[PDB]
């Protein structure tokens with residue numbers, strides 16, 4: 001996350017961290033239930049093997065509430081394409097269930113039509129993660145969040161050097177130096193409605209981070225709400 | 234009555250019928266007797282920040 005702020009205790013409890021063959025974070029995810037994590041399909045190619053950490057806010061401190069879970073099943077979207085990042089979505093089933101607690105709780109899955117009319121029409125959503133704090137920088141050791149404006153699709157397409165499919169949306173700022181970044185990849189974009197946070201996006205890609213005239217690109221979760229339900233059984 | 238004005242007074246999901254609105258809630262909540270509010274069924278309902286240390 002470039003700009004934004006550190007997540008306060010209890011404020012980002014749906015954040016998951018995928019950890020590679022080093023206990024190093026390389027992507028985010030979103031807690032959906034005791035057994036399921038939502039992430040980006042493109043993250044699955046970035047480490048041969050990985051585990052999921054929940055409850056972490058500071059990767060350099062053993063607070064005591066963190067827990068690591070192994071992955072039992074990876075359910076990648078069967079139309080995911082590395083060339084365009086179209087269909088950039090996956091669900092992970094964990095081998096053991098998450099115990100919800102301080103800093104560990106699921107984000108809500110909204111009903112589709114209402115999400116389209118009511119969530120995607122809000123001014124902003126929130127993105128979070130442990131990703132880089134500037135494009136050429138290093139990952140944050142502390143969990144950050146950022147309020148990102150929804151950006152209309154026509155503006156989105158004109159801004160981009162690459163195709164923006166209807167499975168994607170833009171969020172963020174034209175010139176203000178705030179954005180998601182590498183390492184936030186796969187993590188949550190949620191939208192608040194009367195103090196309840198609903199899953200609306202997955203951090204997918206960008207042309208650099210916080211560049212002038214570029215936006216962050218997110219997987220459009222409304223397009224996949226039925227797919228998520230099926231994937232979770 | 235309409236979902237476009239104050240979300241039909243629903244706490245969460247709103248859908249319009251011929252004359253009325255119908256409210257509903259995400260899993261882990263029960264729609265209240267008033268037909269509008271969503272009541273959590275457990276201590277870590279989806280979408281809520283964990284601010285009351287139990």
Ligand SMILES: C[N+](C)(C)CCCN1C(=O)[C@@H]2[C@H](C1=O)[C@H](c1coc(-c3ccc(Cl)s3)n1)N1CCC[C@@H]21
Pocket residue numbers: 082083084085162179180181182183185203204205206207208209215216217218
């Ligand atoms: C056109 N398309 C193929 C989708 C571009 C993919 C570009 N891209 C990569 O190749 C990945 C990923 C990314 O977005 C990642 C990256 C850079 O910036 C970001 C983000 C910026 C804003 C976001 Cl929202 S995600 N992700 N790159 C740095 C490390 C891996 C590589």
Ligand code: NA
Pocket residue numbers: 056057058059060061062063066
């Ligand atoms: Na920690």
Ligand code: NA
Pocket residue numbers: 172173174175176210211212213214215
């Ligand atoms: Na920008």
